[PDB]
Every structure is written in C-alpha cells, then in structure tokens.
Design a protein around this ligand. Sequence first.
Ligand SMILES: Cc1cc2nc3c(=O)[nH]c(=O)nc-3n(C[C@H](O)[C@H](O)[C@H](O)COP(=O)(O)OP(=O)(O)OC[C@H]3O[C@@H](n4cnc5c(N)ncnc54)[C@H](O)[C@@H]3O)c2cc1C
Ligand SMILES: Cc1cc2nc3c(=O)[nH]c(=O)nc-3n(C[C@H](O)[C@H](O)[C@H](O)COP(=O)(O)OP(=O)(O)OC[C@H]3O[C@@H](n4cnc5c(N)ncnc54)[C@H](O)[C@@H]3O)c2cc1C
Ligand SMILES: c1cc2c(ccn2CCC2CCNCC2)cc1-c1ncc(C2(N3CCCC3)CCCCC2)s1
Ligand SMILES: c1cc2c(ccn2CCC2CCNCC2)cc1-c1ncc(C2(N3CCCC3)CCCCC2)s1
Lengths: 492, 492
Amino acid sequence: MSKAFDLVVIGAGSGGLEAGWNAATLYGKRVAVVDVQTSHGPPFYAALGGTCVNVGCVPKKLMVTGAQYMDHLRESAGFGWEFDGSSVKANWKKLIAAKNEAVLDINKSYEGMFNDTEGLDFFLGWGSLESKNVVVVRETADPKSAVKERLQADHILLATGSWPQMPAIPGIEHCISSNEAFYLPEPPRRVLTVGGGFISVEFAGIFNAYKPPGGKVTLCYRNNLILRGFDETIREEVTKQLTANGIEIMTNENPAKVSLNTDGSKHVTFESGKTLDVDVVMMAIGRIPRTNDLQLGNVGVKLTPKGGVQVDEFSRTNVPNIYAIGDITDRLMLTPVAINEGAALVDTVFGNKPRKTDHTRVASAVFSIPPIGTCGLIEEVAAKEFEKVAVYMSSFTPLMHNISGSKYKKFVAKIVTNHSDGTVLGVHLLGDGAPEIIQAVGVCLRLNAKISDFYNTIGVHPTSAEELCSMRTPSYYYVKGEKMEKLPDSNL
Amino acid sequence: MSKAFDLVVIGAGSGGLEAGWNAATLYGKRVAVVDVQTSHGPPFYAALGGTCVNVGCVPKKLMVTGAQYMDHLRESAGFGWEFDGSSVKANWKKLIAAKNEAVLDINKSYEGMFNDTEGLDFFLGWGSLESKNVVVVRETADPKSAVKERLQADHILLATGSWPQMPAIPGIEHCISSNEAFYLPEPPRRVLTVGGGFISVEFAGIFNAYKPPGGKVTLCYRNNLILRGFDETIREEVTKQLTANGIEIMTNENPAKVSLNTDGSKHVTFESGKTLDVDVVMMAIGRIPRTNDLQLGNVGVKLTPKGGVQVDEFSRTNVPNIYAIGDITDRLMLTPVAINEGAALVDTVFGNKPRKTDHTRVASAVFSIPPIGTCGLIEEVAAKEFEKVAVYMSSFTPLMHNISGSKYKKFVAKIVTNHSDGTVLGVHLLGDGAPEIIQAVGVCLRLNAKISDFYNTIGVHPTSAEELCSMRTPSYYYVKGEKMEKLPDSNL
Ligand SMILES: Cc1cc2nc3c(=O)[nH]c(=O)nc-3n(C[C@H](O)[C@H](O)[C@H](O)COP(=O)(O)OP(=O)(O)OC[C@H]3O[C@@H](n4cnc5c(N)ncnc54)[C@H](O)[C@@H]3O)c2cc1C
Ligand SMILES: Cc1cc2nc3c(=O)[nH]c(=O)nc-3n(C[C@H](O)[C@H](O)[C@H](O)COP(=O)(O)OP(=O)(O)OC[C@H]3O[C@@H](n4cnc5c(N)ncnc54)[C@H](O)[C@@H]3O)c2cc1C
Ligand SMILES: c1cc2c(ccn2CCC2CCNCC2)cc1-c1ncc(C2(N3CCCC3)CCCCC2)s1
Ligand SMILES: c1cc2c(ccn2CCC2CCNCC2)cc1-c1ncc(C2(N3CCCC3)CCCCC2)s1
C-alpha cells in the first residue's frame, strides 16, 4: 500500500538533508531520513542537521567570533578606547549557552521541516544495512539492539559523515575530541590540543581567548610544521602568529600515555619523555569515515585503502542502488561539497539530467586567528604536474596594526600560475578577510582566470584584498619541479 | 642641459606618483614631481602622497576602524565578555595622534624613495604652466610670488586632484570641510555633516563613536535619500542602520545660514526654516577639480563644461604633450582609478603598447558601519540599457548579530543581470566584509561572469560571501524598463 521509499537516507547531515529535500519537493519522491538524535549535544553530539550544524561549522564560527573579542578589546586601546582592564571576564558558560540556543534553533526548524513536507519523513535511531534494499533502524548502535523500523528502499544513500580519530595509547579515555569540547562545563585553565589540522588550530584560539587567568594552551604536532596540506609560507606565518598570541606550539611531539592526577587534571607523558600537566586533552589528529555501525558487510559494499567508501564521479558504489556522499567518501571533508554531491546525486537519478560535482578548485577557510583562505593548488603540488610554475608573493603588515598594537599580524597573499598561459592554479591568503575574500576568487578559477585578469583589475582601496591586484611580477618559479629565483634563459 | 626632464608632474598624489615612479623605474626617464608639502597637515593638508594618503582613504579608514570599536565593545556582551560598561570612553586625541603617526610614516617613506631613485626628483613648491614646455614652481599659489625653479618638460602631467566645495552661505566661515575634520582638537558633542555622499556618511559614523556623553550626530541632505548613485535598497538600509546607531538623518534639508552663539557654538538655519544648534558643521556636499592655481589659460588647456580638465581616453588634453589624470578630470574620483590612469599613461607615452583605463565595472567601497561593497551597474541603469533585466536579491540578519544584539545589521546582496544571456551587470553588498568581498567580484566582471558561474561555484562555509553563490532564481525582473515580480509569457 505504502510501498517502499523512492530513497532512504542514513545520516541527516549537510549532504543527507540536501538530497532528501531535493527529491520530496523537487521530484515528489518518497524519502526517509534516519538520524540518531533530534537535538544537538551528548551523548551523540552530532544530530539532526549534521556535524556542520551541531558540532562543526555553525557552533565553531560563533565561538571563534567570541574569541576574536579578546583581540578586539586589547586593540581598541590604540584607537583611544579605555575601560577597566582588570574587570574584563571571558564568561565561557555564557558563550556556550548562546551557542546552544543558536544550534537548537536550527535543530527545531529542521524538526519542523519534516512535519510539513509530504514524502519527507524522519526516523529516529541507528541505521544499519540489512539486504541490498533494506535499511535497519535500531534503538542503539549495537547490532543486537531492539528494532523500531525496517525501511524498504529503492535507493539507499550513505551519508553518515565522519568521526574523530583517536590514537591507541594508555589513558585515551581521559581525552576528548572536538565533539566534547563544545560542551565543557567550564573553560579549561590548561588545555593541550593534539595534532596539526585546522580543527586543532581553530580550537587553540578559542581556548586561548576564554581560558581563566593563569592558563596556557599548548598545541602539539608529531611532525615539524603544522597545517600540513596548506601553503608553506602561510604555515610558518600562522605558527608565528599563534605564538605571538600566547599559544605554545610544540612540534615534533606526540603523547604516549595519559594519567589522572589527585585533582582530576590529566598527566601527559610524551614519546620524548617530556611531561605536561593540563586540565583538558583534546585529540584532533584526523577524521576517519564513519562506517562501523553500518554493517556494510551484509551487502558487500567496497571500501578504499583508507577506511572510506569507494565511489565514482557520480557517488555510486559496487552495490547497484547504494550511493555515498559527504565525509564518508574520505575525499574533501567540506560541508558545501557534501551539499553539492547530494544535490547532484538526485537530479542525476530522479531527474535524468546527470550532473556531477567538481572536486577541484574549491574554496575553503580556516577560521583561526588569524584566519586562512585558500583555493586551488599549492606551489609544491603544481610543481609535480606542471611544466613552468610561477609564484606571486606579498606579505605586508596590514594598515591598522601599526596603531592596533599587533604588529605581528602580517597579512600574506600568494598566487600560483602555470607560467605557460598564466592561468591561476591557486590563491592562498592569511589575515583577516581571507575567508570572505577567497569566496569570490573561487568563481574566478571556475572561469580560468589568468594572472593578467587579476592585476589588470582596478582595486578597491583601501583593502587587504586589493593586494591580489597589485602583484605583477613573480617572486620565484618552479620549472621542472625545482625552485630557483630567476628563470634561466629559454632553451626550449 | 640641466632642468630638462622627460616628465614633470604637478601633484605628488595617487596618480602623479604612480606616473613618475613608473616612468623612472620602468623606463629610465628623468622625472620631476612638484607638490606643496612633504608631510600631511595644515596649512595645505594634502601633501606628498596625495589626498588619499594625508586627508583621504588612509586616515578615514583608521578612524572608521576606531569607531567600529564602539560596536565591538557593545556586541561582545552577547559572547560572554563582561566588564564595567560605565567605564568605557573614547579618547579623541589619542585617535588623532595615532592617525598622525601612521600618515607621517607614509610621508617619510615616499621621501627617500626620491632620495634613492635616480631620475626621480621632488620639488617643493606650487606648480603652474608658463608655456607649453615649461613648468614654473613658485613659493606660493599666488602668481606674484617668487619663482623657485623653471622646469623644462617634454611632457607635463596635471595631477592636482580636487578640493572641497563650500556653499556660499552667510556664516560659511564658521564651517569646516573633511580637511579640517581630520585635525579637530576635541570631538564635537553636537555635529552636523552636510551632504548625502560617502564622506558625510563615513564621518557621521566616526563622530557618532567618539562624541562625548550627551552628544548627537546629525546628518542632513537636501534631497529625499542619501547616497545617490548607489543601489536603492542599500541606500535605504544604510539609512535605517545609521538611525539605529544614534545618527539622526535630516533629509530634504539644506543649511541656509550659520551664526555664532555666546558660548561659541553654531546656530544653523535651514531653508525649510528649522534650526539646529551644533558645535561643528562639516560640509561634504562635493569636491571640485583643483584647476584654480595651474594657470591653464596661459597655455589654453580646455576645461569640461562640468569644470574638469578635458581629456580623451588616453588622458591627452587639447594641448599636445599635456596630460591630466585623477580628480582633476572629474570622472571617477577614486585612488585606484588615478593610479591605473597614471600607469596607463606612462606605458603609452614611454612604451610600445598603448593602454587605456577601463572606467566601467569598477568596484568601489564606502566605509560606513556596516560598510558597502559595490561594483557595476545598479537596477535603474541596467533597465535603461538592456532588454530584460533580472535582479537576484538576498537580505537577512546574520546569526552572529542575532547574538551580538545588533539585530538591525541586515546583510544585503543584490545581483543585477541581463536575462538575455545571464551576464552579471553589477553586484551590491551591505554589511561586515562587503569591501573585501567585492574586490574579487571586480575580477569576475572583467571576465564577463554569468549568474550561473556564481551559483555553480562551491561556497565557503560559513561566510557572508556564500550568499552570492546561493541566489538561483530572480527575486523580480525589469522588462523594457518596468519593474515586475515575474516575467511575460512563454518565450521558447
Ligand atoms: C570541528 C569541525 C569544524 C568544521 N568546520 C567546517 C567548516 O568551517 N567548513 C566546512 O565546510 N566544513 C567544516 N567541517 C566539516 C563539515 O562539518 C562536514 O564535512 C560535513 O558535516 C560533511 O557532511 P556529511 O552530511 O557528509 O556529514 P554529517 O553532516 O556529519 O552527517 C552525519 C550524520 O549522520 C548521523 N549518523 C551517523 N551514523 C549514523 C547511523 N548509523 N545511523 C543514523 N544516523 C547516523 C550523524 O549523527 C550525523 O548527524 C568541520 C568539521 C568539524 C568536526
Ligand atoms: C575624505 C576623502 C576620503 C576618500 N576615501 C577614498 C576611499 O576610501 N577610496 C578611494 O578610492 N578614494 C577615496 N577618496 C578619493 C581620493 O582621495 C582621490 O580621488 C585621489 O587622491 C585622487 O588622486 P589624485 O592624484 O588625482 O589627487 P591627489 O591624490 O589629491 O593629489 C593631488 C596633489 O597635488 C597637490 N597640488 C595641488 N595643487 C598643486 C600645485 N599647484 N602645485 C603642486 N602640487 C599641487 C596637492 O597637494 C595633492 O598632494 C577619498 C577622498 C576624500 C577627500
Ligand atoms: C525550514 C523550516 C520549515 C520548512 C518547512 C516547514 N518549516 C517550518 C515548519 C513550521 C511549523 C509551525 N511553526 C512554524 C514552522 C523548511 C525549512 C527549510 N530549511 C531549509 C530549507 C532549504 N534547505 C533544506 C536543508 C538546508 C536548507 C530548502 C532547500 C533550499 C535551501 C533551504 S527549507
Ligand atoms: C617606498 C620606499 C622606498 C622606495 C624606494 C626607496 N624607498 C626607501 C629607501 C629605503 C627603503 C628600504 N630599503 C633601503 C632603502 C619606494 C617605495 C615605494 N612605495 C610604494 C611604491 C609604489 N608606488 C610608487 C609611488 C606610490 C607608490 C610602487 C612600488 C609598489 C608599491 C607602490 S614605491
């Protein structure tokens, strides 16, 4: 009578929802959506709306913004602003509540989005894969827990997102991930964030701003240089500016064991023998694809070398009617890329207008302090796949920071081109504005903009972004993969 | 032999300096630049560096920045930052002192650039035309004053910018312009900016921040709506947000006379008949090209019916080898336009590649609070130019401001289109980050980007700029000049 579902979706995240909505309202398809919670927060943290809405994008930006105010208050003095210095208090409990109310607002809107949209229905619980055309809902992630639904499905979309990777050292239970950090009752006086990724960096600034008096945020990384994958000079610069803002950046170090002290603080021993006492130890060493609770062995879905789900240019798996999008694919773990993959999967299946999503030349940010903006390739990657590579550099200390009192806040801007046709292959910014600036740059790369298109554009003065139009000559080259300043005389 | 140059520049401003530097460092020409001061301030205000450096873009930017801190301190309470509100106060003298230092540093560096660059010589004095090939530098703007030098010039470039226009009302003596506003001893308790342009609006925000207790900023404009030439919706939103901050906006009002009071304050009487008692009256009703002291009649350089120096698309005047650029031409009074006009002039005259400054689709800004970023045409003009016009629009109060308490701060993001092909004709933004966002949008327009090229681009989450890659369907249309919420019929 009610049949199956033209599509069932496991995980109602960024991609899960964009697919179920573009199907119930765009194609009148029957759609089911399974997620494990309706409101943000413990015990599962991520809930209806995805990691982005509950324990990622939205709540992180709000907290970084709140953390920027530490700099604002300090820098106002240069512009003549005075107020009781010793009376300032960074009220973390107040910040978390403001955030929680923002998140729950989105939780309810989506909560209502399902209650007035025929063909779109929400099923609370855990989704496991039974047959190649049946999704199993259970009260908990345990495969032997009670069942509440068995959703007959014509198409099955896997969109469970990803999960924080934890290492195998003694005392790892005394550690937290990004998940639990959003819900600390109090701000930690001493915090150690492990790893070098954007999550560890972004939370180092947040903790650094709301820490009570006498606190130290120590970031450790097992290798030499943090923010692996981002442009090099931006990496060293960001390291320098994190230090300036009081964060201890402790590279070439790795926790080896963690114990509790008589007061509940964590005692951390490293692989190099050095010890550190902190009140919180946050692991941010990577995000793995979230596939364990899916029972993908019941149907034989294939996984890549990394624990991720294998897919093609259309998000299809070996099983004919099973697709995967979002962070479960282990590709570009970004929200708009999951929204793009989801929207594309639908109108290629339920709309016979096949259009895939482009994974190259994608804009992304890193709301650190200072923030990062990037798009395209970095210079050392362009080298390994491009004849002649040009690099445009420019690192001015912004206008206002001679007054502000923050001379260290050096704004950086790199452009990377194929020197043959001058086509821009990358753009890398560091400094306030980088996230908002890079967005419109993403459109340019989608239009094959050559460098001439940039410096021949009239600037908007005075801005930081004008520095992208002010670079007319390379600072060095990458020819044959090698880096020398000058570019040796032709010779074919 | 001596005092015979390749180029003589009257006015060491934005366009002038670019012209000379390029001519000397890029083509090894003997260059001479004349200006009336080496450092900012009275009695001449403008100086080496131009109006932008000494009494223009640079100084106001720093002061707007300082005024933004009034909002920052207030908005920080929503994010958990506590402190004695009553203890806050802004020190206007520290702001000016700080701004003076920053401007002075630029003055100091531009000098020494002359000292270290051969073929580039500076001449302190007042320049004017004696003959087609001779620039005279006198001790004062008066023709009767002492000659300092006579400079033989194969080419002369007029780059003296513009000057504040002051209406000839009785009591005008008791008023100031933007020039003197940069050097007030104390912040006015009561102030009246006159004019609906970007200078009056920007200063309203600065005075509104630094006014002592019980103050009141009052902006008046003789017409019904401020910021003519900007997108209407933005015009009306900025008006609301200005009122939302404390600035009172008197429209359809124009001062008729000013008189002194016993205490020494001002008594304004408008045409309509109303009266306002204010401590300062800042005129910003426009700026006229500074042709007064050049002796253009001695040579016959023709002026425009509007009052600027007449120049073709290559900046050539009716008189051979005499050129003009910048505000003196009375076109787009923007620093990068003059700079680009200067660099183009040098390439053409001293190179083997003609270059002319594209004056359309120039991205400009306006540093109100919040700011405006725009580029390209606005609805009305597009409707006069194209057949079918589409208008993509997006307006909301960012989530960060629902928390900060500043709920009036509604973001705006229009996009004008020619529906006959999709090419973006203009972009108009309002809110935090707009000036930075618009810069790369200027690159996209030079590439004739289409509306599809924006929404088919993957966005950066979470940012204000996302709203540009999110408008897919027009909010309304403009067919044959008329506005309508939907189109006509069929149209295969
Ligand atoms: C701290 C942090 C900051 C980030 N910041 C950014 C940023 O600034 N910009 C950006 O673009 N990206 C950011 N990301 C990444 C972004 O949030 C994710 O890439 C995005 O959520 C991916 O979309 P998705 O739908 O695939 O995953 P998700 O949105 O996480 O979808 C997974 C959902 O499925 C549910 N689920 C899981 N297993 C099951 C199951 N068995 N049964 C039922 N439901 C299940 C989960 O509870 C969750 O609701 C950030 C991530 C983190 C952790
Ligand atoms: C308050 C204000 C704010 C502004 N803000 C912005 C902004 O945010 N962005 C933007 O793009 N533009 C802005 N502008 C516009 C910008 O200042 C001018 O458009 C720009 O400086 C024009 O450059 P120019 O070289 O043509 O003239 P100027 O830069 O003004 O140069 C003219 C120079 O010639 C000198 N001079 C004059 N007469 C003589 C003479 N007889 N002999 C020798 N030297 C002489 C003057 O001393 C002056 O230094 C602003 C302008 C003002 C007034
Ligand atoms: C929000 C609230 C909604 C509905 C439908 C009903 N409601 C509220 C129910 C009412 C109940 C009574 N009280 C008032 C609210 C729909 C929404 C939507 N969010 C987002 C939507 C869109 N995607 C969905 C997933 C991310 C964004 C739809 C696709 C285009 C972008 C916005 S659509
Ligand atoms: C500043 C200081 C300079 C020079 C040349 C020498 N100085 C100082 C001398 C010392 C500098 C530090 N090293 C030791 C020598 C040149 C500059 C320049 N600013 C800006 C310049 C530019 N246009 C020139 C005219 C207006 C701005 C042209 C170069 C790119 C930035 C803009 S050029």
